[PDB]
Design a protein around this ligand. Structure first.
Ligand SMILES: CNCC[C@H](Oc1ccc(C(F)(F)F)cc1)c1ccccc1
Ligand code: NA
Ligand code: NA
Ligand SMILES: [Zn+2]
Length: 208
């Protein structure tokens, strides 16, 4: 346990609910706070082609019934263990996974791991576990309207505001408590959690 655990978000939404744009805006806002960038993890087995310790890793379109290999990898990523992603297949040197944020999205209502033990392990890692709701005036034919939603309407974590950012077009609902957030509010909550985990007091508390 030498690593601070990444702060992890899981977004559940129907197809066309804006999941991919939401994770890429949340990730870019967080990544810029850390003077870094976003990396989308390839879904295929050697998942880390292009990984350069970017501050934000995104996993889009998680399936409802993941492979044991996928569960295993995810549980390593979102933990305090030092580990080297599978890079030998890419003929690239082993580098440590050090990204402090992991964002994922799924069309599944609930992720079912192979065993209930694995389901518990996933649940303790999805620190922010949120449902996406698209507001009906910003959706047509089940698809979020991006021109409408990005048109400039101030926000805390973005330069300009738009319906996507301030909760007019898309909202996030906490799956446990039903508390509701805009995208802007969610970035604040996630960065606050990152600061909590890196604070001196928190890291010292772990010595007892
Ligand atoms: C074959 N297509 C799905 C492969 C895989 O799906 C996953 C689904 C769930 C998880 C979990 F649960 F977070 F571990 C991890 C991966 C995935 C999805 C997106 C990015 C990397 C891996
Ligand atoms: Na948490
Ligand atoms: Na509509
Ligand atoms: Zn706005």
């Amino acid at each position: 346990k030498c690593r601070i655990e990444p702060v992890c978000l899981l977004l559940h939404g129907s197809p066309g609910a804006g999941k991919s744009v939401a994770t890429n805006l949340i990730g870019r806002s967080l990544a810029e706070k850390l003077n870094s960038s976003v990396y989308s993890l390839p879904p295929d087995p050697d998942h880390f082609d292009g990984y350069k310790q970017q501050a934000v890793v995104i996993m889009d379109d998680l399936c409802q019934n993941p492979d044991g290999k996928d569960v295993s990898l995810f549980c390593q990523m979102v933990s305090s263990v030092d580990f080297v992603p599978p890079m030998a297949a890419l003929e690239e040197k082993g580098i440590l996974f050090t990204s402090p944020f992991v964002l994922a999205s799924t069309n599944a209502g609930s992720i079912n791991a192979p065993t209930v033990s694995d389901s518990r392990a996933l649940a303790r890692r999805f620190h922010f576990d949120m449902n996406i709701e698209v507001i009906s005036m910003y959706s047509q034919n089940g698809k979020i309207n991006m021109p409408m939603s990005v048109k400039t309407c101030c926000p805390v974590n973005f330069k300009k505001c738009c319906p996507l950012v301030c909760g007019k077009a898309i909202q996030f609902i906490d799956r446990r408590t039903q508390v509701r957030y805009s995208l802007d509010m969610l970035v604040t909550e996630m960065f606050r959690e990152y600061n909590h985990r890196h604070s001196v007091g928190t890291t010292l508390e772990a010595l007892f």
